[PDB]
Design a binder for these strands. Structure first.
Ligand SMILES: [Mg+2]
Ligand SMILES: [Mg+2]
Ligand SMILES: [Mg+2]
Ligand SMILES: [Mg+2]
Ligand SMILES: [Mg+2]
Ligand SMILES: [Mg+2]
Ligand SMILES: [Mg+2]
Ligand SMILES: [Mg+2]
Ligand SMILES: [Mg+2]
Ligand SMILES: [Mg+2]
Ligand SMILES: [Mg+2]
Ligand SMILES: [Mg+2]
Ligand SMILES: [Mg+2]
Ligand SMILES: [Mg+2]
Ligand SMILES: [Mg+2]
Ligand SMILES: [Mg+2]
Ligand SMILES: [Mg+2]
Ligand SMILES: [Mg+2]
Lengths: 234, 117, 252, 68
RNA sequence: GGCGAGCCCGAGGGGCUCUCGCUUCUGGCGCCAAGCGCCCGCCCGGCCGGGCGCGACCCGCUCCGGGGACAGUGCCAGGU
RNA sequence: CUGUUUAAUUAAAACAAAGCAUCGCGAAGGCCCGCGGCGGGUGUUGACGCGAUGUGAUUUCUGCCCAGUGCUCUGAAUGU
RNA sequence: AGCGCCGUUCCGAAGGGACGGGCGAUGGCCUCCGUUGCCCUCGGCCGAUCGAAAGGGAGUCGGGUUCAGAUCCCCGAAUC
């Protein structure tokens, strides 16, 4: 209140010094940073083939979460619970002297070789394919193969997200072959929408050429010249 | 994080203090240069003998590894007499000749009689 | 035979520039926000003699708009500046002697020096003592501009590059004959080891393609093509004509 | 089960699906250094039939040479 | 954004189309934010000590420009 | 002209030299080196510069030949 | 191919430091100092390292002394 003035600064050119701005877009990044950024931009610039543009066309978040709520309880046994089942089953068979107390374990198979065998021999009910496989040759046979063999398949985003249900880092594939009593109606409800998305639209998807997207500066320049063409015509 | 500088540099990260699981030479390599091995000779030339009377100063022959502080400690810890200062030179035969001036309280003649020269 | 005098320059053992006593490379400002969107003030502190260079060398200080610090650059001194004249540089900077400004602002007929070929390499063309380029014929769309170089080459360049306005100080330097050997010796002792040029006729046949024989005569045609290999291009080098001149030059 | 499909998809390497991956990987490997350590092989079956069993101790280097 | 000028209809207004803008007599000085507005421990409606945003617009896929499917590099062929 | 040279036979009329000319080149360039990379040198340079030669102060002069031999420009102009 | 060569800022994540503040720990006279860990703020290096017994480089002069030392030993007076 007594003295307490306002001392404004003037940030014009040729006078008082500039403040620290954000500088996100101008920092000289190192090599691997620039490599992965130009790698993404190069995927967006070129014309990707239709065998691999199928990825970036994947299942949405709600249906992916419902599929994960299904697959969360078909969890294969990790080391602790496998040890528990082995030791406890040995103890109970040594106590009760039984022959076959184990009825049936329904469990999901994982891994590309274990999936592909089941899809060839037509045991698979539902094939879950991860999105982010960096050698895409590890996958790109699977969509046309599941299309021929009639097993419905769904592309889900996040190969690490398939690892948290299989107690591992990368999983790449999840097979559904065998279901419980309650989960049959939920699985068929999933398979209907997945056949609506992927398998029945395969002949549509196989001819799309993804990508071929020019840089936004160049697109803006061509659009401004198109407005100049509109100024010339009308 | 609002990255002000245009230069991107490393983050200062965590460097561990070394904590080995075993010693790597089983033992401290013992000091070969102890007090009886520092000072080899006293010297009984006439020119060195003249300094004993005239300058209250002793003359010794020292191995070349030993420096002036170690000579100044070794003369005290063997002969129980103080050291004013120490001059050294490399005698051209190869050894080190060290002049040790004593304190003004002590007597170079008495110390010469009690070391034997 | 032995290696000729021409080929030893590529070794660089005793033919490097005598580059100790020089002050620095005479560059413009590295182009940034202020020189493309405004103008920025600068004081010339002094001018000095850059050794081996006929141009006098100005030391122009700038204020740095990012760090609280004065920066110091080295411009080629245009004719007619003096310690205390302000140097104005930027896009919309007003046109006087010393004011380095892009060629898109200046009208045709402007006489400049110390310009950039490509926009942003801090001065390449027309830098020697007493020279000037001349700006003509702007195209508004596709920003290009013709310039006359001090030889007579008419060159089309981009319009985003910068140039200082006037002539490089120190003209008329060839108007005095050196007139004795010693001043030429001090000149080339400042520059580089290139003095005592022996007449490839005078030197011996293992040392040059010309010399030898009983009389001092070449014996070969002294115009040698450009497809000729190294060590051969002596004398006139792919001369499209020779003899004493006629006309101006008239080369298109 | 599936490495046969891997090998056959890599087999006819002049087709349009694979040569895009090959061109992307050529640019990728050219922008990096001359010798470095890939964490995992880019041809899993072909590296595996030369003896790569993915366990602790089998390193994969990527290395670059000049032609001619 | 009008302290602006514009080129129009127009009663204000429209953005039709834009121009960019906060330093030109002077051998000076300029950083580490004033002010604003919210939130805490702190003294019965007060005092001391801290933090966050606006000041400094938002979004976006290459640091910015200039070339460019050429020049260049590899191999093959013919002149010199 | 001063200068320099064949140390261990030459001191010169030789060599350079200022002056006079001539030619290439506007940097993706000239002229070079390099076994190799757009690696070096001229270049911390830009035609009053760099590179390659001829002649050899000043004064007065620079005649005549494109047949040969080079060099260069031109056009798929049309034979090989 | 290769012992290696080129290269000295060029295609590089090349600073282990400090100021204060906060949280935490340890120890001494746990008064209060001294360490250590984490976090915030700040910090162009035109680059490791080498290169001069004539360049740069703070600070010593006098007297005496030996068969041989001397601005070094002594005596006395100073300085960084
Ligand atoms: Mg000459
Ligand atoms: Mg000559
Ligand atoms: Mg001769
Ligand atoms: Mg020859
Ligand atoms: Mg003849
Ligand atoms: Mg591993
Ligand atoms: Mg670009
Ligand atoms: Mg183009
Ligand atoms: Mg000589
Ligand atoms: Mg003689
Ligand atoms: Mg060159
Ligand atoms: Mg003459
Ligand atoms: Mg004639
Ligand atoms: Mg003819
Ligand atoms: Mg040194
Ligand atoms: Mg010295
Ligand atoms: Mg004395
Ligand atoms: Mg003497």
């Amino acid at each position: 209140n007594p003295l307490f003035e306002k001392r404004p600064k003037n940030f014009g050119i040729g006078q008082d010094i500039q403040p620290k701005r954000d500088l996100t877009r101008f920092v000289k990044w190192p090599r691997y940073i620039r490599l992965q950024r130009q790698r993404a931009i190069l995927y967006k610039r070129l014309k990707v083939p239709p065998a691999i543009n199928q990825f970036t066309q994947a299942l949405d978040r709600q249906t992916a979460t419902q599929l994960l709520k299904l697959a969360h309880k078909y969890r294969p046994e990790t080391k602790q619970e496998k040890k528990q089942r082995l030791l406890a089953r040995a103890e109970k068979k040594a106590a009760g002297k039984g022959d076959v107390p184990t009825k049936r374990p329904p469990v999901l198979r994982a891994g590309v070789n274990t999936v592909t065998t089941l899809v060839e021999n037509k045991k698979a009910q539902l094939v879950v394919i991860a999105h982010d496989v960096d050698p895409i040759e590890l996958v790109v046979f699977l969509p046309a193969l599941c299309r021929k063999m009639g097993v419905p398949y769904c592309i889900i985003k996040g190969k690490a997200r398939l690892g948290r249900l299989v107690h591992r880092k990368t999983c790449t594939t999840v097979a559904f072959t065998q279901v419980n009593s309650e989960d049959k109606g939920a699985l068929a409800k999933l398979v209907e929408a997945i056949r609506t998305n992927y398998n029945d639209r395969y002949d549509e998807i196989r001819r799309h050429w993804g990508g071929n997207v020019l840089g936004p500066k160049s697109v803006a320049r061509i659009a401004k010249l198109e407005k100049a063409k509109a100024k010339e015509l009308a | 994080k609002i990255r002000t500088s245009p230069t991107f540099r490393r983050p200062k990260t965590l460097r561990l203090r070394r904590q080995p699981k075993y010693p790597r030479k089983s033992a401290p390599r013992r000091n070969k240069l102890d007090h009886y091995a520092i000072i080899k000779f006293p010297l009984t030339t006439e020119s060195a003998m003249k300094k004993i009377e005239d300058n209250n100063t002793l003359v010794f022959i020292v191995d070349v590894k030993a420096n002036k502080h170690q000579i100044k400690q070794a003369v005290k810890k063997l002969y129980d007499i103080d050291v004013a200062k120490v001059n050294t030179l490399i005698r051209p035969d190869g050894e080190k000749k060290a002049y040790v001036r004593l304190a003004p309280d002590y007597d170079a003649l008495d110390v010469a009689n009690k070391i034997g020269i | 035979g032995r290696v000729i005098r021409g080929q030893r320059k590529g070794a660089g053992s005793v033919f490097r520039a005598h580059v100790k006593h020089r002050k620095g490379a005479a560059r413009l400002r590295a182009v940034d926000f202020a020189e493309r969107h405004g103008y920025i003030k600068g004081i010339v502190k002094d001018i000095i003699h850059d050794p081996g260079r006929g141009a006098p060398l100005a030391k122009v200080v700038f204020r740095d708009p990012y760090r609280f610090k004065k920066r110091t650059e080295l411009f080629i001194a245009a004719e007619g500046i003096h310690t205390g004249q302000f140097v104005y540089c930027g896009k919309k900077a007003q046109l006087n002697i010393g004011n380095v400004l892009p060629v898109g602002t200046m009208p045709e007929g402007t006489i400049v020096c110390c310009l950039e070929e490509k926009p942003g390499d801090r001065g390449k063309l027309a830098r020697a003592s007493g020279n000037y380029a001349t700006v003509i014929s702007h195209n508004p769309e596709t920003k290009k501009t013709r310039v006359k170089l001090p030889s007579g080459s008419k060159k089309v360049i981009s319009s985003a590059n910068r140039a200082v306005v006037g002539v490089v100080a120190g003209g008329g330097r060839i108007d005095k004959p050196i007139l004795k050997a010693g001043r030429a010796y001090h000149k080339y002792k400042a520059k580089r080891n290139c003095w005592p040029r022996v007449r490839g006729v005078a030197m011996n046949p293992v040392e040059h393609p010309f010399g030898g024989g009983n009389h001092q005569h070449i014996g070969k045609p002294s115009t040698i093509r450009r497809d000729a290999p190294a060590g051969r291009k002596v004398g006139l080098i792919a001369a499209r004509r020779t003899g004493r001149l006629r006309g101006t030059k008239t080369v298109q | 089960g599936a490495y046969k499909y891997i090998q056959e998809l890599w087999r006819k390497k002049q087709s349009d699906v694979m040569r895009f991956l090959l061109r992307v990987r050529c640019w990728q490997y050219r922008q990096l250094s001359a010798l470095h350590r890939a964490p995992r092989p880019t041809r899993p079956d072909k590296a595996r039939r030369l003896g790569y069993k993915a366990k602790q101790g089998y390193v994969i280097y990527r290395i670059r040479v000049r032609r001619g």
